[PDB]
């Protein structure tokens, strides 16, 4: 049960080279990294 | 059960080279990276 | 049970090289890193 | 049971190289790192 | 039972290299690091 | 039962290299490090 | 002589009623209000 | 002579009623209010 | 002669009623209020 | 001669009623209030 | 001659009513109040 | 000649009513109040 609302998000990313993971501004749920 | 609403998101990305992962402004659910 | 609302988030990222983990501005749920 | 609301968060990140963990501006839930 | 609200948080991070743990501006819940 | 509200937190971090633990500006709940 | 460049501006306005002045996200020049 | 560049500005405004002045996110030049 | 660059500014405004002056996130130049 | 650069400014304003002066997050130059 | 750089400023303002002066987070130059 | 750099300033203001002077977190230059 998730109730996510009324979000004002600003994401600044600069110089993102060779990214292999997760870069999410707003994430609802689950993140699995192996 | 997901209830995501009323989101004001701004995503800035600059210099994204050789990306191999996930770059999501707003993600609802699940992210699996291996 | 999650009730997340009315968030004003600003995320500054600079010089993110060779990222292999999770970089989330706002995360609701679970993060598993192995 | 989580009730998180009315948050004004500013996150500054500079020189994030070879990140393998979790860098979250605002995290609600659980973080497992192995 | 968590009731977290009305937070004004500013996080400054500079020179974060080879991070393998958790760096969270505001964390609600549980953090397990092994 | 947690009731955390009306917090004005400023976190300064400089020269964080090879972090393997938890660095949280404001933590509500439990932290387990092994 | 004005040289304004490379600006990343995000403006949030909410509940702007009966405005009689100037509300500008980014202004270059002069503002005269009488 | 003005040289303004490389600005990352985020402006939050909430409950702006009966405004008669100037509300500018980023202003370059002159502001005269009488 | 003005040389203003590389600014990361976040402005929070809440409950701004009957404003008659100047509310600027970042101002370069001159402000005259009479 | 002004040389202002590399500023990380966060401004919190709450309950600003009947403002007649100047409220600037970052001001470069001159402020005259009469 | 002004050389102002590398500033990390956080400004908290709460309950600012009937302001007639200058409230600046970071001011470079001159302030004249009469 | 001014050389001001590498400042980490936090300013807390609470209950600022009927301000007619100057309230500056960090001021470089001159302040004249009459």
Swiss-Prot record, chains A, B, C, D, E, F, G, H, I, J, K, L:
Mutation effect (residue 26 to V): In CAA-APP; Italian type
The residues that the database entry marks as glycosylated are 2
List site positions: Cleavage.
8-9, 11-12, 32-33
Mutation: residue 13 to G; reported impact is: In AD1; Flemish mutation; increases the solubility of processed amyloid-beta peptides and increases the stability of peptide oligomers
Organism domain of life: Eukaryota
Provide the effect of residue 16 to C: Causes formation of an artifactual disulfide bond with PSEN1
Task: Give residues annotated as binding Cu(2+) 2.
Answer: 2, 5-6
**UniProt-annotated stretches for the region Interaction with PSEN1:** 16-34
- Residues binding Zn(2+) 2 are 2, 5-6
> What quaternary structure, including any partners, is listed in this protein's UniProt entry?
Interacts with FPR2.
> What is the name of this protein?
Amyloid-beta protein 42
